[PDB]
Design a protein around this ligand. Structure first.
Ligand SMILES: CN(C)c1ccc(C(=O)NCCCCCCC(=O)NO)cc1
Ligand SMILES: [K+]
Ligand SMILES: [Zn+2]
Length: 364
């Protein structure tokens, strides 16, 4: 059955007002629309998240504060709740947060109701927010909210974070439970945000070994990334037997991102995505980071094509943002001539560590 595409003109307009990524949502949607991919999808208007739905993870104190300042960047309680340079108390930020949370919840509900096997919210994936604090441009953790909605039907949910940054907010939220396993492939290097997610972080208490982290260094390309991803997910699948998947596909790993860390292309990420889709589980697709706006659109458009199993023309079709795609005006991204800093011995060590940990899961 046909993938659900979480979309409304209002939703994109709201997502467009996010101060760190202005107009990104429109560029992503308009490229998908320019490739006519939306015609092959079921378009679903997202619901706005209610106070009660948001409070299934976030505290009432934090949410009431967010609501207050959304109507104010100099409040004395904002520092406590993580509001600052990374998460400015922009006017309307509570509405933008409620829209993105509601969108991912709507995606989850569609999956629960058997409307689709795959549901897409490219504007979601704000995985750093904590129950009571904003963090890393994230004011509300829609990925956690999405997982909590899926928990209505699924007893084993797998969260997979393929983003440059560790999905710390999500991992933390489920650190003590075994119903949700988190798997994160991300850059791990002292001083690099958020600073967590070493391979030794495996969760706590009853959630011990139900958090998986794959610390990766600068320069990694498609082939090695896919090998790492396939070997981990093969072990996770056999060990954990997930019944639903929440997959975050950040674009901030792609060559050309100004963070200039990993050296991936959308084709490489696509392979990881294909590996997960062939499990044929209810899958909630989210975006994430992506700071080269045109490349982020290239990436999520291509990946939408993968979900649909469609091969797209390399030539960017004319559309509202055509000029943003110069000077080559093509869909494909070329890797930078930068060294891969990932030692094959270190990769193997990490993978063996992880296999060791998942052995404990299997024997349980
Ligand atoms: C050029 N400029 C003004 C900035 C550049 C980088 C950051 C930053 O990395 N901040 C730390 C927070 C990064 C959050 C990343 C969100 C994400 O992609 N998560 O996956 C801030 C400002
Ligand atoms: K867990
Ligand atoms: Zn990121």
């Amino acid at each position: 059955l046909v993938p659900v595409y979480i979309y409304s003109p209002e939703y994109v307009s709201m997502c467009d007002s996010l101060a760190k990524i202005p107009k990104r949502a429109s560029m992503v949607h308009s490229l998908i629309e320019a490739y006519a991919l939306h015609k092959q999808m079921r378009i679903v208007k997202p619901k706005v998240a209610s106070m009660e739905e948001m409070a299934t993870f976030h505290t009432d104190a934090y949410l009431q504060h967010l609501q207050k300042v959304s109507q104010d960047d100099d409040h004395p309680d904002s520092i406590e709740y993580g509001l600052g340079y990374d998460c400015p108390a922009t006017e309307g930020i509570f509405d933008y947060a409620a829209a993105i949370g509601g969108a991912t919840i709507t995606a989850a509900q569609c999956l629960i109701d058997g409307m689709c096997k795959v549901a897409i919210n490219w504007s979601g994936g704000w995985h750093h927010a904590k129950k009571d604090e904003a963090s890393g441009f994230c004011y509300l953790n829609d990925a956690v909210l999405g997982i909590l909605r899926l928990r209505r039907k699924f007893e084993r949910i797998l969260y997979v974070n393929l983003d440059l940054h560790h999905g710390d907010g999500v991992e933390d939220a489920f650190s003590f439970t075994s119903k949700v396993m988190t798997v994160s492939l991300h850059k791990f290097s002292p001083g690099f945000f958020p600073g967590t997610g070493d391979v030794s972080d495996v969760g706590l208490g009853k959630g011990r070994y139900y958090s998986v982290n794959v610390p990766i260094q600068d320069g990694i390309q498609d082939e090695k990334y896919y090998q790492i991803c396939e070997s981990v997910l093969k072990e996770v699948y056999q060990a954990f037997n997930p019944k639903a998947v929440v997959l975050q596909l950040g674009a901030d790993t792609i060559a050309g991102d100004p963070m200039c860390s990993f050296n991936m292309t959308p084709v490489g990420i696509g392979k990881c995505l294909k590996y997960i889709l062939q499990w044929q589980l209810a899958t909630l697709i989210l975006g994430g980071g992506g700071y080269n706006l045109a490349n982020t659109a290239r990436c999520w458009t291509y990946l939408t094509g993968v979900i649909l199993g469609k091969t797209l023309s390399s030539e960017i079709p004319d559309h509202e943002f055509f000029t943003a795609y110069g000077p080559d005006y093509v869909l494909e991204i070329t890797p930078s001539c930068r060294p891969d800093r990932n030692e094959p011995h270190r990769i193997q060590q990490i993978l063996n560590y992880i296999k060791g940990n998942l052995k404990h899961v299997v024997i349980e």
